[PDB]
Design a protein around this ligand. Structure first.
Ligand SMILES: [Cl-]
Lengths: 212, 210
Protein backbone atom coordinates (compact mmCIF):
# COMPACT_ATOMS: atom_id res chain seq x y z
CA UNK A 1 0.00 0.00 0.00
CA UNK A 2 1.41 3.33 -1.08
CA UNK A 3 -0.29 6.68 -1.49
CA UNK A 4 0.86 8.36 -4.72
CA UNK A 5 0.60 11.98 -5.78
CA UNK A 6 -0.01 12.89 -9.45
CA UNK A 7 1.65 16.24 -8.92
CA UNK A 8 4.01 17.29 -6.13
CA UNK A 9 3.55 20.99 -6.83
CA UNK A 10 0.46 23.02 -7.62
CA UNK A 11 0.39 26.60 -8.80
CA UNK A 12 -3.02 28.05 -8.15
CA UNK A 13 -4.76 31.25 -9.24
CA UNK A 14 -6.07 33.69 -6.61
CA UNK A 15 -9.84 33.46 -6.25
CA UNK A 16 -10.26 30.12 -8.02
CA UNK A 17 -11.13 26.72 -6.61
CA UNK A 18 -8.22 24.36 -6.05
CA UNK A 19 -8.30 20.56 -6.15
CA UNK A 20 -5.27 18.59 -5.01
CA UNK A 21 -5.09 14.81 -4.97
CA UNK A 22 -3.66 11.77 -3.20
CA UNK A 23 -4.24 8.44 -4.89
CA UNK A 24 -4.43 5.03 -3.23
CA UNK A 25 -5.20 1.42 -4.35
CA UNK A 26 -8.85 0.35 -4.88
CA UNK A 27 -9.53 -3.03 -6.55
CA UNK A 28 -12.95 -4.09 -5.25
CA UNK A 29 -15.67 -1.62 -4.34
CA UNK A 30 -15.02 1.05 -1.75
CA UNK A 31 -15.41 -0.15 1.84
CA UNK A 32 -16.24 3.13 3.58
CA UNK A 33 -16.16 1.77 7.12
CA UNK A 34 -12.50 0.78 6.77
CA UNK A 35 -11.32 4.02 5.18
CA UNK A 36 -9.77 7.06 6.80
CA UNK A 37 -8.83 10.12 4.84
CA UNK A 38 -7.15 13.05 6.54
CA UNK A 39 -5.94 16.33 5.09
CA UNK A 40 -3.83 18.83 6.97
CA UNK A 41 -1.75 21.93 6.41
CA UNK A 42 0.57 23.64 8.87
CA UNK A 43 -0.98 21.37 11.51
CA UNK A 44 -4.49 22.72 10.96
CA UNK A 45 -7.06 20.03 10.23
CA UNK A 46 -8.77 20.54 6.90
CA UNK A 47 -10.65 17.27 6.47
CA UNK A 48 -11.15 14.13 8.51
CA UNK A 49 -13.15 11.49 6.67
CA UNK A 50 -14.19 8.44 8.64
CA UNK A 51 -17.17 6.06 8.37
CA UNK A 52 -18.14 7.55 5.02
CA UNK A 53 -18.50 11.08 6.35
CA UNK A 54 -16.64 14.29 7.12
CA UNK A 55 -15.90 14.75 10.84
CA UNK A 56 -16.49 18.49 11.09
CA UNK A 57 -15.93 19.12 14.84
CA UNK A 58 -12.16 18.63 14.26
CA UNK A 59 -11.88 20.93 11.24
CA UNK A 60 -10.01 24.19 11.80
CA UNK A 61 -12.44 27.13 11.63
CA UNK A 62 -10.20 28.62 8.93
CA UNK A 63 -11.58 25.94 6.55
CA UNK A 64 -15.22 26.08 7.59
CA UNK A 65 -17.37 26.08 4.42
CA UNK A 66 -14.20 26.48 2.32
CA UNK A 67 -13.13 22.85 2.09
CA UNK A 68 -14.57 19.51 1.03
CA UNK A 69 -13.60 16.01 -0.02
CA UNK A 70 -14.94 14.99 -3.43
CA UNK A 71 -16.90 11.85 -2.48
CA UNK A 72 -17.31 10.48 -6.01
CA UNK A 73 -13.57 10.39 -6.63
CA UNK A 74 -13.01 8.08 -3.63
CA UNK A 75 -14.48 5.01 -5.37
CA UNK A 76 -11.80 5.51 -8.04
CA UNK A 77 -8.98 5.56 -5.46
CA UNK A 78 -8.60 9.34 -5.45
CA UNK A 79 -8.68 11.48 -2.32
CA UNK A 80 -9.37 14.85 -3.91
CA UNK A 81 -9.50 17.87 -1.64
CA UNK A 82 -11.28 20.91 -3.02
CA UNK A 83 -10.83 24.35 -1.45
CA UNK A 84 -12.89 27.27 -2.71
CA UNK A 85 -11.92 30.91 -3.21
CA UNK A 86 -8.18 30.47 -2.94
CA UNK A 87 -6.33 33.15 -1.05
CA UNK A 88 -2.65 34.02 -0.96
CA UNK A 89 -2.63 32.51 2.55
CA UNK A 90 -3.45 29.06 1.14
CA UNK A 91 0.05 28.63 -0.24
CA UNK A 92 1.98 26.06 1.74
CA UNK A 93 2.58 22.38 2.37
CA UNK A 94 -0.48 20.10 2.44
CA UNK A 95 -0.32 16.61 3.90
CA UNK A 96 -2.71 13.77 3.17
CA UNK A 97 -2.86 10.55 5.08
CA UNK A 98 -4.89 7.61 3.86
CA UNK A 99 -5.74 4.43 5.73
CA UNK A 100 -7.30 1.61 3.73
CA UNK A 101 -5.82 -1.89 3.92
CA UNK A 102 -2.55 -0.13 4.74
CA UNK A 103 -1.38 3.35 5.68
CA UNK A 104 0.67 6.01 3.89
CA UNK A 105 1.05 9.77 3.56
CA UNK A 106 2.29 12.33 1.05
CA UNK A 107 3.10 16.03 1.02
CA UNK A 108 1.92 18.48 -1.64
CA UNK A 109 3.23 22.00 -2.21
CA UNK A 110 0.74 24.70 -3.20
CA UNK A 111 1.79 28.03 -4.64
CA UNK A 112 -0.67 30.85 -5.16
CA UNK A 113 -0.36 33.83 -7.47
CA UNK A 114 -2.86 36.49 -8.52
CA UNK A 115 -2.48 36.96 -12.26
CA UNK A 116 -3.30 40.28 -13.99
CA UNK A 117 -5.79 38.54 -16.32
CA UNK A 118 -8.86 40.55 -15.40
CA UNK A 119 -8.11 43.73 -17.33
CA UNK A 120 -10.55 46.63 -17.32
CA UNK A 121 -10.19 48.88 -20.35
CA UNK A 122 -11.58 52.25 -21.31
CA UNK A 123 -10.95 54.78 -24.05
CA UNK A 124 -11.53 58.53 -23.94
CA UNK A 125 -11.71 60.59 -27.10
CA UNK A 126 -9.89 63.72 -25.97
CA UNK A 127 -10.14 65.82 -29.14
CA UNK A 128 -11.62 64.44 -32.37
CA UNK A 129 -9.93 67.28 -34.25
CA UNK A 130 -6.41 66.06 -33.43
CA UNK A 131 -7.63 62.47 -33.02
CA UNK A 132 -6.08 62.44 -29.56
CA UNK A 133 -7.19 59.45 -27.52
CA UNK A 134 -6.39 58.34 -24.02
CA UNK A 135 -6.36 54.58 -23.48
CA UNK A 136 -6.39 53.10 -20.01
CA UNK A 137 -5.86 49.51 -18.81
CA UNK A 138 -6.19 48.44 -15.16
CA UNK A 139 -5.84 45.17 -13.24
CA UNK A 140 -4.86 43.88 -9.82
CA UNK A 141 -2.62 41.01 -8.87
CA UNK A 142 0.52 39.93 -7.08
CA UNK A 143 3.39 40.35 -7.45
CA UNK A 144 3.59 43.73 -9.22
CA UNK A 145 3.35 43.76 -13.00
CA UNK A 146 4.54 46.47 -15.38
CA UNK A 147 2.41 47.67 -18.31
CA UNK A 148 3.89 47.69 -21.85
CA UNK A 149 1.87 49.49 -24.51
CA UNK A 150 2.38 48.48 -28.14
CA UNK A 151 0.96 49.51 -31.52
CA UNK A 152 -0.46 46.95 -33.92
CA UNK A 153 3.08 47.17 -35.36
CA UNK A 154 4.35 45.70 -32.07
CA UNK A 155 6.33 48.94 -31.60
CA UNK A 156 6.60 49.95 -27.92
CA UNK A 157 4.74 53.11 -26.92
CA UNK A 158 5.08 55.64 -24.13
CA UNK A 159 2.74 55.30 -21.17
CA UNK A 160 2.21 56.42 -17.60
CA UNK A 161 1.74 53.64 -15.06
CA UNK A 162 0.60 54.04 -11.48
CA UNK A 163 1.06 51.28 -8.92
CA UNK A 164 -0.55 51.16 -5.48
CA UNK A 165 -1.81 48.67 -2.92
CA UNK A 166 -5.28 47.39 -3.86
CA UNK A 167 -8.09 48.85 -1.77
CA UNK A 168 -10.22 45.75 -2.48
CA UNK A 169 -8.09 42.73 -1.62
CA UNK A 170 -5.36 43.63 0.82
CA UNK A 171 -2.09 42.05 -0.33
CA UNK A 172 -2.59 42.71 -4.06
CA UNK A 173 -1.33 45.57 -6.21
CA UNK A 174 -3.51 47.79 -8.34
CA UNK A 175 -1.83 48.71 -11.61
CA UNK A 176 -3.40 51.21 -13.97
CA UNK A 177 -1.68 52.59 -17.04
CA UNK A 178 -2.58 55.28 -19.53
CA UNK A 179 -1.45 55.88 -23.10
CA UNK A 180 -1.97 59.23 -24.86
CA UNK A 181 -1.83 58.94 -28.62
CA UNK A 182 -3.14 60.41 -31.86
CA UNK A 183 -4.84 57.75 -33.92
CA UNK A 184 -7.80 56.79 -36.08
CA UNK A 185 -10.95 54.66 -35.94
CA UNK A 186 -10.36 50.88 -35.95
CA UNK A 187 -6.68 51.16 -35.10
CA UNK A 188 -5.53 48.39 -32.78
CA UNK A 189 -3.56 48.78 -29.53
CA UNK A 190 -2.28 46.31 -26.90
CA UNK A 191 -1.80 46.75 -23.16
CA UNK A 192 0.37 43.99 -21.73
CA UNK A 193 0.66 43.33 -18.00
CA UNK A 194 4.07 41.72 -17.54
CA UNK A 195 5.57 40.09 -14.49
CA UNK A 196 9.01 38.37 -14.37
CA UNK A 197 10.64 35.40 -12.60
CA UNK A 198 8.80 33.50 -13.97
CA UNK A 199 7.72 35.60 -16.93
CA UNK A 200 3.96 35.89 -17.39
CA UNK A 201 1.96 38.12 -19.77
CA UNK A 202 -1.69 39.14 -20.01
CA UNK A 203 -2.77 41.45 -22.78
CA UNK A 204 -5.96 43.29 -23.66
CA UNK A 205 -6.79 44.33 -27.19
CA UNK A 206 -8.10 47.91 -27.47
CA UNK A 207 -9.78 49.05 -30.69
CA UNK A 208 -10.27 52.75 -31.45
CA UNK A 209 -14.00 53.40 -31.70
CA UNK A 210 -16.09 55.40 -34.13
CA UNK A 211 -18.25 57.95 -32.32
CA UNK A 212 -20.86 60.02 -34.25
CA UNK B 1 -15.50 1.19 -12.01
CA UNK B 2 -14.18 3.63 -14.60
CA UNK B 3 -16.12 6.89 -14.23
CA UNK B 4 -15.81 10.27 -15.89
CA UNK B 5 -16.54 13.24 -13.64
CA UNK B 6 -16.95 16.98 -13.98
CA UNK B 7 -15.79 19.39 -11.26
CA UNK B 8 -18.14 21.97 -12.84
CA UNK B 9 -21.37 21.07 -14.62
CA UNK B 10 -21.89 24.70 -15.74
CA UNK B 11 -19.57 27.49 -16.92
CA UNK B 12 -20.41 31.09 -17.60
CA UNK B 13 -17.83 32.52 -19.95
CA UNK B 14 -17.22 36.11 -21.02
CA UNK B 15 -17.58 36.87 -24.75
CA UNK B 16 -14.23 37.13 -26.53
CA UNK B 17 -12.12 35.42 -23.89
CA UNK B 18 -10.86 31.86 -23.62
CA UNK B 19 -12.60 29.06 -21.80
CA UNK B 20 -11.35 25.77 -20.47
CA UNK B 21 -13.92 23.15 -19.52
CA UNK B 22 -12.82 19.96 -17.79
CA UNK B 23 -13.67 16.27 -17.54
CA UNK B 24 -11.80 14.02 -15.14
CA UNK B 25 -11.06 10.33 -15.54
CA UNK B 26 -9.00 8.00 -13.30
CA UNK B 27 -5.29 7.64 -14.02
CA UNK B 28 -2.98 5.39 -12.02
CA UNK B 29 0.74 4.80 -12.74
CA UNK B 30 1.91 6.22 -16.08
CA UNK B 31 -0.71 7.50 -18.53
CA UNK B 32 -0.70 5.16 -21.52
CA UNK B 33 -1.39 7.62 -24.37
CA UNK B 34 -1.62 4.59 -26.71
CA UNK B 35 -4.91 3.30 -25.30
CA UNK B 36 -6.47 6.68 -24.43
CA UNK B 37 -9.41 8.08 -26.40
CA UNK B 38 -10.89 11.51 -25.70
CA UNK B 39 -13.70 13.00 -27.81
CA UNK B 40 -15.15 16.46 -27.24
CA UNK B 41 -18.35 17.28 -29.13
CA UNK B 42 -21.28 19.69 -28.83
CA UNK B 43 -24.73 19.35 -30.34
CA UNK B 44 -23.90 17.79 -33.72
CA UNK B 45 -20.39 19.23 -34.12
CA UNK B 46 -17.07 17.43 -33.64
CA UNK B 47 -14.60 19.48 -31.62
CA UNK B 48 -11.71 17.28 -30.50
CA UNK B 49 -10.85 13.70 -31.32
CA UNK B 50 -7.85 12.28 -29.50
CA UNK B 51 -7.24 8.71 -30.66
CA UNK B 52 -4.10 6.63 -31.00
CA UNK B 53 -2.17 9.20 -28.97
CA UNK B 54 -2.76 12.05 -31.40
CA UNK B 55 -5.36 14.71 -32.07
CA UNK B 56 -7.38 13.79 -35.13
CA UNK B 57 -8.70 16.97 -36.74
CA UNK B 58 -10.07 15.55 -39.97
CA UNK B 59 -13.72 15.46 -38.93
CA UNK B 60 -13.43 18.60 -36.79
CA UNK B 61 -15.99 21.34 -37.36
CA UNK B 62 -15.21 24.56 -39.22
CA UNK B 63 -16.26 26.67 -36.22
CA UNK B 64 -13.30 25.39 -34.21
CA UNK B 65 -10.55 25.19 -36.79
CA UNK B 66 -7.64 26.98 -35.08
CA UNK B 67 -9.31 27.74 -31.76
CA UNK B 68 -9.94 24.38 -30.03
CA UNK B 69 -7.35 22.15 -28.36
CA UNK B 70 -7.01 19.49 -25.68
CA UNK B 71 -4.43 20.46 -23.08
CA UNK B 72 -2.19 17.39 -23.28
CA UNK B 73 -0.52 18.87 -20.24
CA UNK B 74 -3.50 17.81 -18.12
CA UNK B 75 -4.05 14.33 -19.65
CA UNK B 76 -1.21 13.01 -17.54
CA UNK B 77 -3.18 14.11 -14.47
CA UNK B 78 -6.43 12.49 -15.63
CA UNK B 79 -7.90 15.84 -16.56
CA UNK B 80 -9.16 16.10 -20.11
CA UNK B 81 -9.29 19.84 -20.54
CA UNK B 82 -10.83 21.44 -23.61
CA UNK B 83 -9.77 25.02 -24.34
CA UNK B 84 -11.58 27.18 -26.81
CA UNK B 85 -10.19 30.61 -27.66
CA UNK B 86 -12.07 33.75 -28.74
CA UNK B 87 -15.43 32.54 -27.39
CA UNK B 88 -18.56 33.74 -29.26
CA UNK B 89 -22.29 33.54 -28.55
CA UNK B 90 -22.47 30.52 -30.86
CA UNK B 91 -20.26 28.55 -28.47
CA UNK B 92 -22.98 28.46 -25.82
CA UNK B 93 -24.70 25.11 -25.43
CA UNK B 94 -24.23 21.60 -24.08
CA UNK B 95 -20.76 20.07 -24.45
CA UNK B 96 -19.93 16.39 -23.91
CA UNK B 97 -16.68 14.56 -23.25
CA UNK B 98 -16.41 10.87 -24.10
CA UNK B 99 -13.38 9.20 -22.58
CA UNK B 100 -12.04 5.66 -22.92
CA UNK B 101 -9.09 4.56 -20.78
CA UNK B 102 -9.50 1.04 -19.39
CA UNK B 103 -13.25 1.53 -19.35
CA UNK B 104 -15.45 4.24 -20.86
CA UNK B 105 -17.77 7.00 -19.68
CA UNK B 106 -19.04 10.43 -20.61
CA UNK B 107 -20.37 13.61 -19.01
CA UNK B 108 -22.13 16.74 -20.19
CA UNK B 109 -21.29 20.35 -19.40
CA UNK B 110 -23.41 23.43 -20.12
CA UNK B 111 -21.63 26.59 -21.24
CA UNK B 112 -23.35 30.01 -21.14
CA UNK B 113 -21.77 32.98 -22.90
CA UNK B 114 -21.95 36.48 -21.36
CA UNK B 115 -21.42 39.57 -23.51
CA UNK B 116 -21.14 42.49 -21.10
CA UNK B 117 -21.04 46.20 -21.85
CA UNK B 118 -17.77 46.51 -19.95
CA UNK B 119 -15.48 48.08 -22.51
CA UNK B 120 -16.85 51.64 -22.34
CA UNK B 121 -15.67 54.39 -24.68
CA UNK B 122 -16.37 58.07 -23.96
CA UNK B 123 -15.97 61.62 -25.20
CA UNK B 124 -16.46 65.04 -23.64
CA UNK B 125 -16.88 67.92 -26.07
CA UNK B 126 -17.46 71.59 -25.39
CA UNK B 127 -20.37 72.56 -27.61
CA UNK B 128 -20.42 76.26 -26.53
CA UNK B 129 -17.94 77.62 -23.97
CA UNK B 130 -19.86 80.85 -23.28
CA UNK B 131 -22.79 78.88 -21.86
CA UNK B 132 -20.52 75.99 -20.79
CA UNK B 133 -22.69 73.57 -22.71
CA UNK B 134 -21.03 70.18 -23.14
CA UNK B 135 -21.87 67.08 -25.03
CA UNK B 136 -21.01 63.80 -23.34
CA UNK B 137 -20.96 60.45 -25.15
CA UNK B 138 -20.61 56.85 -23.93
CA UNK B 139 -20.55 53.86 -26.20
CA UNK B 140 -20.12 50.13 -25.64
CA UNK B 141 -21.00 46.81 -27.24
CA UNK B 142 -22.56 43.62 -25.85
CA UNK B 143 -25.60 41.32 -25.90
CA UNK B 144 -28.53 41.70 -25.61
CA UNK B 145 -29.61 45.37 -25.83
CA UNK B 146 -28.70 47.70 -22.98
CA UNK B 147 -30.18 51.01 -21.92
CA UNK B 148 -27.98 53.90 -20.86
CA UNK B 149 -28.53 55.77 -17.60
CA UNK B 150 -26.96 59.20 -17.00
CA UNK B 151 -26.34 60.39 -13.43
CA UNK B 152 -24.24 63.08 -11.78
CA UNK B 153 -22.33 63.71 -8.57
CA UNK B 154 -24.80 66.51 -7.80
CA UNK B 155 -27.51 63.86 -8.26
CA UNK B 156 -29.54 65.64 -10.94
CA UNK B 157 -32.09 64.30 -13.44
CA UNK B 158 -30.45 63.60 -16.79
CA UNK B 159 -31.95 62.52 -20.09
CA UNK B 160 -29.78 61.61 -23.05
CA UNK B 161 -30.50 60.25 -26.54
CA UNK B 162 -29.54 56.63 -27.21
CA UNK B 163 -28.97 54.86 -30.53
CA UNK B 164 -28.79 51.06 -30.73
CA UNK B 165 -27.39 49.52 -33.92
CA UNK B 166 -25.76 46.26 -35.03
CA UNK B 167 -22.09 46.07 -34.13
CA UNK B 168 -19.95 46.36 -37.24
CA UNK B 169 -16.99 44.43 -35.79
CA UNK B 170 -18.82 41.73 -33.84
CA UNK B 171 -21.65 40.23 -35.90
CA UNK B 172 -24.07 39.19 -33.14
CA UNK B 173 -23.55 42.12 -30.73
CA UNK B 174 -25.33 45.46 -30.39
CA UNK B 175 -23.52 48.78 -30.43
CA UNK B 176 -25.10 51.20 -27.96
CA UNK B 177 -24.28 54.91 -28.04
CA UNK B 178 -25.74 57.56 -25.78
CA UNK B 179 -25.28 61.30 -25.91
CA UNK B 180 -26.11 63.82 -23.19
CA UNK B 181 -26.24 67.58 -23.61
CA UNK B 182 -25.67 69.46 -20.38
CA UNK B 183 -24.47 72.82 -19.08
CA UNK B 184 -21.77 72.15 -16.54
CA UNK B 185 -19.11 73.65 -14.32
CA UNK B 186 -15.63 72.11 -14.59
CA UNK B 187 -14.57 69.09 -12.48
CA UNK B 188 -18.13 67.97 -11.73
CA UNK B 189 -18.48 64.25 -12.35
CA UNK B 190 -20.96 62.44 -14.58
CA UNK B 191 -21.74 58.73 -14.88
CA UNK B 192 -23.05 56.70 -17.81
CA UNK B 193 -24.39 53.32 -16.78
CA UNK B 194 -25.08 50.57 -19.28
CA UNK B 195 -27.94 48.57 -17.79
CA UNK B 196 -28.42 45.19 -19.40
CA UNK B 197 -30.63 42.24 -18.51
CA UNK B 198 -30.45 38.42 -18.48
CA UNK B 199 -28.63 38.43 -16.21
CA UNK B 200 -28.92 41.98 -14.86
CA UNK B 201 -25.52 43.65 -15.14
CA UNK B 202 -24.59 47.30 -14.68
CA UNK B 203 -21.38 48.82 -16.02
CA UNK B 204 -20.58 52.50 -15.56
CA UNK B 205 -17.94 54.91 -16.79
CA UNK B 206 -16.95 58.07 -14.98
CA UNK B 207 -16.79 61.23 -17.09
CA UNK B 208 -14.80 64.11 -15.63
CA UNK B 209 -15.22 67.56 -17.16
CA UNK B 210 -11.78 69.18 -17.61
CL1 LIG C 1 4.92 50.23 -16.32
Amino acid sequence: FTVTVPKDLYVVEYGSNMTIECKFPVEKQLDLAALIVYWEMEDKNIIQFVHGEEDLKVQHSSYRQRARLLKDQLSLGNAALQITDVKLQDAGVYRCMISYGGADYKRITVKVNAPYNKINQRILVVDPVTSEHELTCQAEGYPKAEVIWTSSDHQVLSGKTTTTNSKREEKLFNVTSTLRINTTTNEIFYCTFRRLDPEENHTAELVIPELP
